[PDB]
Write a protein that binds this ligand. Structure first.
Ligand SMILES: [Cl-]
Ligand SMILES: [Cl-]
Ligand SMILES: [Mg+2]
Ligand SMILES: [Mg+2]
Ligand SMILES: [Mg+2]
Ligand SMILES: [Mg+2]
Ligand SMILES: [Mg+2]
Ligand SMILES: [Mg+2]
Lengths: 236, 6, 236, 6
């Protein structure tokens, strides 16, 4: 693509500069270029990829939610007709958001997931796949909504199965996967009991394994455990 | 407060 | 342009939605489209234009400063050679920033300023012209730097001359112009004494005119007076 | 602290 003439190492260096500059669309474009070199990604590089796109899509999701809220209010009894503009602009943001999700899913399918054999990489990419289908599901309203939801579920479930076999209960990737799959259950799948049960079980199994950890791993794990607790407190 | 993801 | 087929009123409505969504590049693009309809802008519309581009360029300036700082550190004794990437990426951000400034300056020249006859509009646009030349001057290092600096000075000075004749000392546009011209003196023109004198005089003349104002105008004016005070405290 | 503009 536009990044085809740039060295892999240079793309990764520039992604790191972009992150420092809070230039996340640039960071995402550099990391896309790095993925498209065809080599597998290191742990650090996977995390750059994730951070870049999470920031890009997160801003799009937040904008979408503002615009959706205005649109919903426009459709209430006694609201003055204002024309097509709110819908059109929400649609514009939505289409851009869908395009970013499709980009990420495309990188995962061509060819990050098929090349990922270690649990660290495979679980990470399948979690990503679940997350970006989840973002698609947040804005879906048509005939494919159930299939989009099922695609997120399937990716998360594959990731969960691997992580339970291959990772300790404190592993931060495992914990973050469980966190996000619980959010899927609560926010997308209309399954708050499943969400609560997964978060509880995850938290408790992690707690029981903290004794095995170094101080620095303890910190890493407990930070994500607190996010599980935050959701449990919100949900109960 | 929204649900927290990571 | 891409906005040519959209109604003026729709562009302005969408600019307001974009602002609510914190989608400032979209806001800027909608307002550019609105300007290119060829009609003069109302007070509210001028302020939408300003807010949009200020936010866009402000983010670019902040990124540029991060990257410039890293580049300067790379050029210190005992710093390891890391290749061309820092310079290249700083250059990329710089070129984008220059392009936004050139866009704004182009709208002012074609044809906002020549059509602006009321002091409110004319001063506002000339202040904008000074500001965007000032942003160009922040990144200038070549043979044209002195001409860029002089272009900012000239625009600000024209704006000051009009505002002193045609506006009360408390007018918020007049005050913001003086604030920014003082920043120009301090940060760009190597004239800290001029900066301090302008901010002092501006503040004091505004103070003496507050008695003429309604409560709401008082609020408006005093908010900008406090910014003058903030700079004076920083600079002295 | 940077200089403040508006
Ligand atoms: Cl639109
Ligand atoms: Cl670059
Ligand atoms: Mg190579
Ligand atoms: Mg009515
Ligand atoms: Mg749609
Ligand atoms: Mg028309
Ligand atoms: Mg050395
Ligand atoms: Mg340059």
């Amino acid at each position: 693509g536009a990044m085809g003439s740039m060295e892999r190492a240079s793309l990764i260096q520039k992604a790191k500069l972009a992150e420092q500059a809070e230039r996340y669309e640039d960071m995402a474009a550099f990391m896309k270029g790095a993925v498209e070199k065809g080599e597998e990604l290191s742990c650090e590089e996977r995390n750059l990829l994730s951070v870049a796109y999470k920031n890009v899509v997160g801003g799009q999701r937040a904008a979408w939610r503002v615009l959706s809220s205005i649109e919903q209010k426009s459709n209430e009894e006694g609201s003055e007709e204002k024309g097509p503009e709110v819908r059109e602009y929400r649609e514009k943001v939505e289409t851009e958001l869908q395009g970013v999700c499709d980009t990420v899913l495309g990188l995962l399918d061509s060819h990050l997931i098929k090349e990922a054999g270690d649990a660290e990489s495979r679980v990470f990419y399948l979690k990503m796949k679940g997350d970006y289908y989840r973002y698609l599901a947040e804005v879906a309203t048509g005939d494919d909504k159930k299939r989009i939801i099922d695609s997120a579920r399937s990716a998360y479930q594959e990731a969960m199965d691997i992580s339970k076999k291959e990772m300790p209960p404190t592993n931060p990737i495992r914990l973050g996967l469980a966190l996000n799959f619980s959010v899927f259950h609560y926010e997308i799948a209309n399954s708050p009991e499943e969400a609560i049960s997964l978060a509880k079980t995850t938290f408790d199994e992690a707690m029981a394994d903290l004794h095995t950890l170094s101080e620095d791993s303890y910190k890493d794990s407990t930070l994500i455990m607190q996010l599980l607790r935050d959701n449990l407190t919100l949900w109960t | 407060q929204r649900s927290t993801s990571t």
